[PDB]
Amino acid sequence: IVEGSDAEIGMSPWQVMLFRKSPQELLCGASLISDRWVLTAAHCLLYPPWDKNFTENDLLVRIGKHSRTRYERNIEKISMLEKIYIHPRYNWRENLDRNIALMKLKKPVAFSDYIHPVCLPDRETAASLLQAGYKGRVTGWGNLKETWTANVGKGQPSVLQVVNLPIVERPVCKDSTRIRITDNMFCAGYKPDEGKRGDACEGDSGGPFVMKSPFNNRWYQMGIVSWGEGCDRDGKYGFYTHVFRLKKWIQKVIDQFGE
């Protein structure tokens, strides 16, 4: 997260860390949507050009984390995956279209002060909240800058980071890049000359862009951190999977396989 700040404890208790077994790496962010289901980006699990095609046994999910590197005993829970599900029309060769994935945990995770699921939007919530100029929140343990001077600057945050970003008009999104933007993408971030800054960055992928409804006080995941051309570059924007746009798939995966 570029130009964010340290999250308060329990601030984003649906935030999940995808953790690689050997070597031990942060893979991606992700989010808790029930006691057995975790939502993330597909390129977190399947990206052939980098020779990435993870099976269930290569990863862990870590839930209730605050510190990036600590094993936070009796706070975080570490779950094994039962099964990975990638959207069947996820397109990696061209533009990361339908960049969405679900993971089912072997066991249900117990909820706590630090571990609690986010809501997914119904139609009225998507229509109300997902409008240009309105701000959502992005969280992750990803990089603090796109590049920094090696072995000197701060690279990874010690603690989960949080940043608030405005949703950007669809025509401005498309004019900021040469990539074909689709239905199931939206973009967010400040314009140059808005003065303020901020972006998701490497290691934040798969994490949640969430919004709070003022009318029921609940947080809804409206987006998944999906892709960017750099981090925090002027006149560039972070792209996000439009979760509501793809909720029918989530429905298909969950009441054919799980809940």
Binding site: P13, I33, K135, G136, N164, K212, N217, R218, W219
Partner: protein
């Protein structure tokens, strides 16, 4: 439109406590 207690944080909404930057999000719905 479904039912399970999602998106209400135990250390914030459930305790009537506001986080440090959520105002910024709420304000954005109304401008200014």
């Amino acid at each position: 439109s479904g039912e399970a207690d999602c998106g209400l944080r135990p250390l914030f909404e459930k305790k009537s406590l506001e986080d440090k930057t959520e105002r910024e999000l709420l304000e954005s719905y109304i401008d200014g």
